[PDB]
A paper describes a structure:
Hemoglobin (Hb) is an iron-containing heme protein that is essential for oxygen transport. The protein is an assembly of four globular subunits, each containing a heme B (protoporphyrin IX group; Hsia, 1998). Equine hemoglobin was among the first protein structure to be solved at high resolution. It is a useful model system for oxygen-sensitive metalloproteins due to its ubiquity and its high but reversible affinity for oxygen.
The most noticeable movement is at the β-heme, where a water molecule is bound in MetHb compared with the empty β-heme in DeoxyHb. The β-heme of MetHb moves downwards to the proximal side of the heme pocket. When hemoglobin changes from the deoxy form to the oxy or met form there is no significant change in the inner region of the α1β1/α2β2 dimer. Visible changes are present in the outer region of the dimer and in the dimer-interface area. The interaction between α1β2 and α2β1 moves towards the centre of the molecule. Residues in contact in the αβ interfaces are between αB (Glu30/A–Phe36/A) and βH (Phe122/B–Lys132/B), αG (Ser102/A–Leu113/A) and βG (Gly107/B–Phe118/B), and αH (Phe117/A–Lys127/A) and βB (Arg30/B–Pro36/B).
Residue numbers in the entry:
A (entry chain B): 1 to 146
B (entry chain A): 2 to 140
The structure:
């Protein structure tokens, strides 16, 4: 990802404040509510029918935490996103058959959640940096479809 | 847009209230910085932080969205001058509507965190897609 030193430091400094459980659980929950076809991949989690059911589902929280943890790995390895997400790219392509469009959707949801949690500290400049990160992650996840 | 979506959109916009223009301006700024390809539609603007042209244009965007919320049953009739502008005169790439939509939701999350619930998020997403559709529908 093309980030200046300034931008990297700002990205890393925000991540220090990210609660992976709360942000993760919220991001995955909002994906399932806002883009309901995404529910097809998570039938094993039980009832995802209304928004109440989605946001309090403990499997949604636990999975959301794993997702954000793995995003954090990417934030800490921005020089090697291809290598960091190789195994996950294979899983999502060959085992799960997730269309890569949905990786961009989740990245964008994550950005909206960061905005919600951080308010006026999530400046337009900081958001711009985060858009570069979520795009880099989405592309590295898409790598083993190409 | 279902009856439930329309209620949620009317509700959420009532909380936006008089801030529509300031949020429109902030969404534009978030878009220009986040997605630099969008700047090429605005060669005639000063795009620096707090430029007055962006504030003025943000107001016009906010006002049009307020208009749309009042005409949810007839978005085509209410927005059709703007469809002509965006499709025939400006030839805006349809992708750019999704970017601005994302930037507006981001802005709303910043300023209305308690009101920006998952159900309200879902209904606003649908509202902004429906508007986008109308503004790209004349090609
Ligand atoms: C874009 C960022 C995304 C990241 C970082 C990510 C990351 C992960 C991780 C870390 C796992 C756990 C694998 C394991 O425990 O071995 C996983 C599993 C999975 N992901 Fe993703 N994912 C992403 C997007 C998506 C999207 C958009 C979908 C679906 C629409 C999806 C569906 C799944 C499913 C079904 C599993 C297996 C769940 C289970 O069996 O418990 N992922 N993902
Ligand atoms: C929700 C989506 C949008 C709304 C409601 C909207 C609304 C408007 C309005 C109300 C005008 C001014 C009409 C007038 O004063 O005659 C306008 C003009 C314009 N719009 Fe949009 N717009 C949208 C999306 C976009 C996007 C995505 C772009 C490009 C990235 C764009 C580019 C422009 C440009 C270049 C003009 C002419 C500005 C000027 O010369 O002053 N619009 N739009």
């Amino acid at each position: 990802v093309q980030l200046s030193g300034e931008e990297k430091a700002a990205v890393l400094a925000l991540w220090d404040k990210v609660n992976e459980e709360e942000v993760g659980g919220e991001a995955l929950g909002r994906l399932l509510v806002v883009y309901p076809w995404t529910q097809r991949f998570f039938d094993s989690f039980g009832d995802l029918s209304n928004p109440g059911a989605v946001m309090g589902n403990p499997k949604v929280k636990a999975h959301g935490k794993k997702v954000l943890h793995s995003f954090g790995e990417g934030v800490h390895h921005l020089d090697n996103l291809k290598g960091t997400f190789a195994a996950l790219s294979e899983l999502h392509c060959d085992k799960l058959h997730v269309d890569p469009e949905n990786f961009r959707l989740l990245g964008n949801v994550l950005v909206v959640v960061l905005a919600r949690h951080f308010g006026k500290d999530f400046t337009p400049e900081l958001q711009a940096s985060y858009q570069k990160v979520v795009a880099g992650v989405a592309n590295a996840l898409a790598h083993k479809y190409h | 847009l279902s009856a439930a979506d329309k209620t949620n959109v009317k509700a959420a916009w009532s909380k936006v209230g008089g801030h529509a223009g300031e949020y429109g301006a902030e969404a534009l700024e978030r878009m220009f910085l986040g997605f630099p390809t969008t700047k090429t539609y605005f060669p005639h603007f000063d795009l620096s932080h707090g430029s007055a042209q962006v504030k003025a244009h943000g107001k016009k965007v906010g006002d049009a969205l307020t208009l749309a919320v009042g005409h949810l049953d007839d978005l085509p009739g209410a927005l059709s001058n703007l469809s002509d502008l965006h499709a025939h005169k400006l030839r805006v790439d349809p992708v750019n509507f999704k970017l601005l939509s994302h930037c507006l939701l981001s802005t709303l999350a910043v300023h209305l965190p308690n009101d920006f619930t998952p159900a309200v998020h879902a209904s606003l997403d649908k509202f902004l897609s429906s508007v986008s559709t109308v503004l790209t529908s004349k090609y």
